[PDB]
Amino acid sequence: NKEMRNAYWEIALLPNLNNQQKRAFIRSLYDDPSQSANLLAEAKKLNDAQAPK
C-alpha cells in the first residue's frame, strides 16, 4: 500500500516532466498498481531525456 503512495509522489515531483506526462504515469499506476516499478523507471528515463540542455 505504501508502495503506491511513494511511486505517486515520486512521479509527481520529477522536475522535467510536464503535468500531462505526470498524469499518464499516475493514471496507469492507479489502473494497475503492480506496474509501479516498471512505470517508475519509464518515467525516470523520460525525465532524464527531457533534462534541460
Binding site: 503506491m4 503512495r5 505517486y8 515531483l13 494497475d32
Partner: protein, 569 residues
C-alpha cells in the same frame, strides 16, 4: 425536518448561479425555523419560490436583495429574532430589487404575519416597483426595547400604488389585497400590555408569548419569547439535574431538557454537542473536551488533567482570522488525525505572497494531511497544484462534520481545479452542509460517488455543473472498475471502490486470492487476502496454509520444529 440553517453570503454574488435557485430549494423546502439568516438574493424574474411558504421564524436577519421576481412568498413569517443583524443594524434589509436599467422588481412585501422583531431595525432602499412600505407602523412590530431600532426607508417608485383596501384598520397594509392589512399587536393593548389579540384586557397575551396569541394561556402563543417546551412557552428549559433534599445528592430530572435554538429538546440533534451546562452546541467551551460515546453521540465534558494539545483549523483559536492554508501555517497540521476547524486552499495558497514574503506552498508539503481523518468544519478548494491529478493527499479523510460552513452553506466545495478524479476514497460522511463541485473541466468520477450515502440530513445535496461531460469520461475509460460493487468509486482503477466486489489485498480489489496459485500464497479472512507464512510450502491444486503463523502450513519448505516451520533444527 421542521428546522434548518440559513446562509451567510449577504450581498456577495452566488458562487454557482446555475444552481443557486436549486440550492435555496434544498435549503428551505418545508423548513419552518431558520437557525441563522434568511438571505434571498439574485432571484430571476419568473423564479418559483413556493418552498419558502412554511417559514414562521428566522433566528438571524432577513435579506431580500438584487432580485428580479415580483413577489416573495413569505406570508407565514411571524417573528425575526435578530440574533445577528445585517451590518449590525437591520433585522430586515430589502435592497435593490428592480431592473438594472412587464418591468421586474419586488411589488409588495406581503409579510402579513410579521408582528415581532426582537432585535434590530429596518432598511428598505432602491426598489423601483415597491409599494406600501411607507404605510406600515414599524414600532408595533418592534419589541418594546426595540422602539428605537433604526429605520431607513426609501420611497421613490416608478409606479403609482393603489390604496390599501378600505377594509384595513388604519390605512396600513402589506399590499393591495384585503388579506394584507397589518395586524397591530403591541400598540393597541389594554394597559401596559406586551402583546394582545384585541382591545380587551382579557385579550392580552401571556408574558411568555412573542408575536401574539389566540388566548391568555402560554399554550396559546403565536411565538415563544424564550423557549418552546413542547407547545408551552417558558423562560428556561426544565433543568437536567435536580438536587434532592432528602438524600443530599443530585439525581437527574426525568423532565430534563436541552436548549436548542429557541426550543427545549430531549436530546441534541444529529451533528450537535451536549454540554454540562444543558445546551446543544456546535463547539465546546474552554476547559471542555470533545468525547465520543460508545454509541456515536458527542458530548462536551470538563478536562480532568488540563486538556491535551489539539490541532486547530482555520476559523479557530489562533487561526480564527486566517483565510487560507499556506507555507506559513502548513506545519501546524503535521501528523494531525483530527482538525478542529476548516481548511481552505485559494490561489494565494499556491502562488505565495512577497508582501509578507510567504513562500508559495509546494505540492510535496501537502503531505502533512496524509494522516488526517476528520474535519469539524468545512473543506474549500479553489486552487490545487496542476501536477496532482486528484485529491489523494486526503485519501484517509473519513468525515467532514460541517459544523462550520463555507458562506454558511457548504461543507465541501471544489471549483476551478483541473484535477481528473477525486480519490477521497475513505470519505464516508458529510455531517451537515451542502456540497458543490463545479467548473472543474477535466473532472470525472463525480456521478460515480454515492453522495446519497455520505449525507446525514435531507437538506443536503450535491450541486454540480460544468465538470467533465460524463460520456466523455467513459470514452476515455475513466469509469468504475469491473470489480467495484454497485458501480461506485472515487476514481480510476481497483484502489478506488467504495465497496469491493470480491476480495481485498491491502487496498486493491481483486478477483481471487492466491489460495491455489500465485507467487506469494494467501489465506482468506473477512474478504481480505492475507499472506501465508514465508516458511510454508506452496501447493499444487490443494490449499497452501490456513492462517498467518508457521503452525498453519500444510507443508514446510525447510524444517519442522512442531508445531511450526523454521529454518533451524
Amino acid at each position: 425536518t421542521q428546522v434548518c440553517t440559513g446562509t451567510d453570503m449577504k450581498l456577495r454574488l452566488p458562487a454557482s448561479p446555475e444552481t443557486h435557485l436549486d440550492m435555496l430549494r434544498h435549503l428551505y423546502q418545508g423548513c419552518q425555523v431558520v437557525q441563522g439568516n434568511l438571505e434571498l438574493t439574485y432571484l430571476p424574474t419568473n423564479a418559483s419560490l413556493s418552498f419558502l411558504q412554511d417559514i414562521q421564524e428566522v433566528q438571524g436577519y432577513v435579506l431580500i436583495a438584487h432580485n428580479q421576481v415580483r413577489q416573495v412568498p413569505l406570508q407565514r413569517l411571524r417573528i425575526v429574532r435578530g440574533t445577528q443583524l445585517f451590518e449590525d443594524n437591520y433585522a430586515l434589509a430589502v435592497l435593490d430589487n428592480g431592473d438594472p436599467l412587464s418591468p421586474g422588481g419586488l411589488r409588495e412585501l406581503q409579510l402579513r404575519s410579521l408582528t415581532e422583531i426582537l432585535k434590530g431595525g429596518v432598511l428598505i432602499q432602491r426598489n423601483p416597483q415597491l409599494c406600501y412600505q411607507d404605510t406600515i407602523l414599524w414600532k408595533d412590530i418592534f419589541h418594546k426595547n426595540n422602539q428605537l431600532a433604526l429605520t431607513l426607508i426609501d420611497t421613490n417608485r416608478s409606479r403609482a400604488c393603489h390604496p390599501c383596501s378600505p377594509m384595513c384598520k388604519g390605512s396600513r397594509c402589506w399590499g393591495e389585497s384585503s388579506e394584507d392589512c397589518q395586524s397591530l399587536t403591541r400598540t393597541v393593548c389594554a394597559g401596559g400590555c406586551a402583546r394582545c389579540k384585541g382591545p380587551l384586557p382579557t385579550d392580552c397575551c401571556h408574558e411568555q408569548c412573542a408575536a401574539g396569541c389566540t388566548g391568555p394561556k402560554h399554550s396559546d402563543c403565536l411565538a415563544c419569547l424564550h423557549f418552546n417546551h413542547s407547545g408551552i412557552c417558558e423562560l428556561h428549559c426544565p433543568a437536567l439535574v435536580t438536587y434532592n433534599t432528602d438524600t443530599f445528592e443530585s439525581m437527574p430530572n426525568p423532565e430534563g431538557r436541552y436548549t436548542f435554538g429557541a426550543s427545549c429538546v430531549t436530546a441534541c440533534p444529529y451533528n450537535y454537542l451536549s454540554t454540562d451546562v444543558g445546551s446543544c452546541t456546535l463547539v465546546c467551551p474552554l476547559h471542555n473536551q470533545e468525547v465520543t460515546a460508545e454509541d456515536g453521540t458527542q458530548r462536551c465534558e470538563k478536562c480532568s488533567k488540563p486538556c491535551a494539545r489539539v490541532c486547530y483549523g482555520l476559523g479557530m483559536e489562533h487561526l480564527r482570522e486566517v483565510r487560507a492554508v499556506t507555507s506559513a501555517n502548513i506545519q501546524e497540521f503535521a501528523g494531525c488525525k483530527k482538525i478542529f476547524g476548516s481548511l481552505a486552499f485559494l490561489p494565494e495558497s499556491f502562488d505565495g505572497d512577497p508582501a509578507s514574503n510567504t513562500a508559495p506552498l509546494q505540492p510535496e508539503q501537502l503531505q502533512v494531511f496524509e494522516t488526517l481523518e476528520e474535519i469539524t468544519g468545512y473543506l474549500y478548494i479553489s486552487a490545487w497544484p496542476d501536477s496532482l491529478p486528484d485529491l489523494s493527499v486526503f485519501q484517509n479523510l473519513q468525515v467532514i462534520r460541517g459544523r462550520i460552513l463555507h458562506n454558511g452553506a457548504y461543507s465541501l466545495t471544489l471549483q476551478g481545479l483541473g484535477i481528473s478524479w477525486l480519490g477521497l476514497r475513505s470519505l464516508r460522511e458529510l455531517g451537515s452542509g451542502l456540497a458543490l463541485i463545479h467548473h472543474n473541466t477535466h473532472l470525472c468520477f463525480v456521478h460515480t460517488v454515492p453522495w446519497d450515502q455520505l449525507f446525514r440530513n435531507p437538506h443536503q445535496a450535491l450541486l454540480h455543473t460544468a465538470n467533465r461531460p460524463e460520456d466523455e469520461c467513459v470514452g476515455e475509460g475513466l469509469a468504475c472498475h469491473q470489480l467495484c460493487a454497485r458501480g461506485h468509486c472515487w476514481g480510476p482503477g481497483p484502489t478506488q471502490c467504495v465497496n469491493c466486489s470480491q476480495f481485498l489485498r491491502g487496498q486493491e480489489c481483486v478477483e481471487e486470492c492466491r489460495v491455489l496459485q500465485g507467487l506469494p500464497r494467501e489465506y482468506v479472512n473477512a474478504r481480505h487476502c492475507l499472506p501465508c507464512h514465508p516458511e510454508c510450502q506452496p501447493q499444487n491444486g490443494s490449499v497452501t496454509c490456513f492462517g498467518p503463523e508457521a503452525d498453519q502450513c500444510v507443508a514446510c519448505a525447510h524444517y519442522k520444529d512442531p508445531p511450526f516451520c523454521v529454518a533451524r533444527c
